[PDB]
Write a protein that binds this ligand. Structure first.
Ligand SMILES: O=C(Nc1c[nH]nc1-c1nc2cc(CN3CCOCC3)ccc2[nH]1)NC1CC1
Length: 274
């Protein structure tokens, strides 16, 4: 499992946000680096809520997966802080935060080139998970982290990474399973044991919607009840103004899991644009 990192070396700084039953902070780690050097490294500290500690098994196994593989688009895990009454994951601090809020805050300066480049990097990471027969389970723009911006003054591209899935939808309560419509695929609302590789093909389609909709949240005007009726009337998401990917979004968000294209195919289609 995890490298154990002592409390004496971690220093909690500013709240950066929250996830599902989790508090997320910028931090500082003291450590001996390469050549016996001493570093004080910026980290990310993710605390499992005090009330929801019973979820700690899924909370840590979800991070356990990312640390079992190694790929340039997967977020690095440094270890777990050892306190006592706490569950703290220490992870790679990414300077530019969530694609989620980056898209909102930059909604007007994103040409479909920048979008397409980020989608290719995301499919690459999802294709690597697919060949390893490994389920993520929570592909959403808020689980995507921006290592590097475009540098509009050179021709460099952005570079993103993919973070933890967090607590499994296997165990979360149903009210929590139903606001993440349309990220949770329709079979998993039926019963979360429908979790399969095919889950990520649906959710990737929803993230593709988010990336094109300047950070709107799909179906944000609907409450839970209506979100369920969205799936029972088997509707689709509307096509974004930026519409070049509306077909790919729909092919990915297929109501039959066995028909969702492989990420091999998703990449090829994604590459066939000018
Ligand atoms: O939410 C997460 N955030 C991070 C993981 N590693 N590094 C981060 C992270 N890094 C962050 C950095 C900022 C500061 N910048 C302010 C303006 O420019 C953009 C962000 C804010 C929030 C940030 N979160 N991780 C998992 C998906 C739930």
């Amino acid at each position: 499992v995890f490298h154990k990192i002592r409390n004496e070396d971690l220093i909690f700084n500013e709240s950066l946000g929250q996830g599902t039953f989790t508090k997320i902070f910028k931090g500082v780690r003291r450590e001996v680096g390469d050549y016996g050097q001493l570093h004080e490294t910026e980290v990310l500290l993710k605390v499992l809520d005090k009330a929801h500690r019973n979820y700690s098994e899924s909370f840590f196994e979800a991070a356990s997966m990312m640390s079992k593989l190694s790929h340039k688009h997967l977020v690095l895990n440094y270890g777990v802080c050892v306190c006592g009454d706490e569950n703290i994951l220490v992870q790679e601090f990414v300077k530019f935060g969530s694609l989620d809020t980056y898209l909102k805050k930059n909604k007007n300066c994103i040409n479909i080139l920048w979008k397409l480049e980020v989608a290719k990097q995301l499919a690459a990471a999802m294709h690597f998970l697919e060949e390893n027969t490994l389920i993520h389970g929570n592909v959403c723009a808020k689980n995507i982290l921006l290592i590097r911006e475009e540098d509009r003054k050179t021709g460099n591209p952005p570079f993103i990474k993919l973070s933890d899935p967090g607590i499994s939808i296997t165990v979360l309560p149903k009210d929590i399973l139903q606001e993440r419509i349309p990220w949770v695929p329709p079979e998993c609302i039926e019963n979360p044991k429908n979790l399969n590789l095919a889950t990520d093909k649906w959710s990737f389609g929803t993230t593709l919607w988010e990336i094109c909709s300047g950070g709107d949240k799909p179906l944000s005007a609907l409450d839970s009840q209506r979100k369920l009726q969205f799936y029972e009337d088997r509707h689709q998401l509307p096509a974004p103004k930026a519409a070049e990917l509306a077909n790919l979004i729909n092919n990915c968000m297929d109501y039959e899991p066995d028909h969702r294209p492989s990420f091999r195919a998703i990449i090829r289609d994604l590459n066939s644009l000018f």
